[PDB]
Amino acid sequence: LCTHLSYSRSLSPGKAVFFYKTAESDFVPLRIEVAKISGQKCGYTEGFDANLKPKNIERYELAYSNPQTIEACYVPPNVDELYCRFSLRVEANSMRPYVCSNPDVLRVMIGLAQAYQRLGGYNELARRYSANVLRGIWLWRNQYTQGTKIEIKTSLGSTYHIPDARRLSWSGDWPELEQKQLEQLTSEMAKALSQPDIFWFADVTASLKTGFCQEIFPSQKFTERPDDHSVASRQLATVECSDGQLAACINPQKIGAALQKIDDWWANDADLPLRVHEYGANHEALTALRHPATGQDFYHLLTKAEQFVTVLESSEGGGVELPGEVHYLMAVLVKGGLFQKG
Template sequence: MELCNLLKYDRSLYPSKAVFFYKTADSDFVPLEAEINRIRGQKAGFTEAFTPQFKPKNLAPQDLTHCNPLILEECYVPPNITHIYCRFSLRVQANSLKPSGCSDPDVHALLEALTVSFNECDGYKELALRYCKNLLLGNWLWRNQNTGHTQIEIKTSFGSCYQIANTRHLDWDSIWPTDAQAALNELSKEFLQALTDPKVFWSADITAKIATTFCQEIYPSQSFGEKAAQGEASKQFSKVKCIDGRYAVSFNSVKIGAALQSIDDWWLEDNIKRLRVHEYGADKEIGIARRSPKSERDFYSLFVNAELYLAELKQQLLNPKESINPDIYYLFAVLIKGGMFQKKAELKKKA
């Protein structure tokens, strides 16, 4: 298969912002607000005392003791509050079943046939299970996972309610207790139906209840914008304006989506590190591409083998004991993420 000049897939996962709040005797929703702090930061960076050539700068002994005034937004649990809540919603649509735009009818037909065979081989079942694991483990809480007892509750548009009593007792690769495994299995069945049936509208309301310590620090999304104006905080959080005019700190939807899509452990055999699904396997922690084009494991190098993968899946239908090629799982995870996958149209040479 050749990449055509127009090829795109709409994303299938639509998370909302995740809002932090707490409860009191008088209210079930009190927004968790950020506070602005002015601090005297230390001058402790490399460039404060050294040149790029690692030569000491000509400084007086007092120069490195001076403070560096900073204005920062910070967020802490209010005194006497023992639990913080974080809540978001998620919609799932069956948009990976076919391209939302394709300039080549043959490519469109091939990709639809590939999806049909992948579904018949129960390929979507594995992907649904992985997304649901991230939901129930609370991976979307990011740094806020490093706390005490955390309960996850998921209410779906099918009228179901699933609950994990304490995520601290679970791990991705561990054997889950019977009740937690049952919740994972049933939730993934609903998720699977939403991924594979375009007639189904499915959504979920997800809430984490986090046990906290006294005045514990909370880590929402940091917003990136233009350079802060004079007197404004240089570090600001993502926020949601509530109906009473107050602003609750939050995670932006992209950060939630990144956590849910952290399922790519197919990039290297026997590797337990799960990357966020990305065309080139971007590993932000180390700052390298795990699926560089030279490796021929990147999305585009694999995607052009669609005819080969279709033949593999059809053969597997005849031999159900065979496992699906991990590269095919990865390809469909990227299609669920969505994006523009075409090549640029070549410029016509002038006569």
């Protein structure tokens, strides 16, 4: 192909904030607190050296405590509902390369995006993204509630409401008056993703029914180990409110990673879906599912466009003929990045 090729990102979210209501004011932030604790002396190198060779210490030396400083966050007594919200904008921005160093490569990438659009296929991507919003998986470790409600508004005037999100699976069929809203939402998004000159903007709120003083899990900061012992080892992310107070939040890219978890196209065995990645990275197992050695990765597939366009053009469309390799590639172009040295 060519020395330089790249796309920017087409689907971008905001920062999510936690808050609650009172009888006296409509918006009170949830906030974090800091505290000293007494820890344990446990684990390897604490008692063993090399490969299971005990080291020489006295019996009493492990009964001592290990103090630490952490930040933490809890819902205060007597709050019945906790609320969380974020904004979302979607642009039809995978139709054109941000940069390209070769006119012959450029005309081909354009041909492909269009050949795909008219046969169907944006619906498929929209259905998958839509499902992840309405399921609620973007709450990560805070999904364990006594009841979760999700509400969405858009710039076109529509409103959607899931009376209880706790049971919607990835694989399966949704209850009536829920399955239907998934279809309607799919239509708005499928268009926003591919047709330009449409402004679309969404506002997603949810509510969590909680326990008496339940623990809450906001995003964590990346830090250096302090050398002071007066500074926290585990620091949490907050956002500044319009009134000057700070509140617990979830970072944009953490919301984003959840929304794009849609890849169950690998190895012809769906399992659970992966975060889209050029090499099929699997963070839980610390490995990769589309190792270059298999021929299944993005970079091998990027060179078969001429063959794919030929098929797309020869196909009738409107059926189930689109192959995994074409869908995969379109999903990667949506999460744009650097595809150079080709």
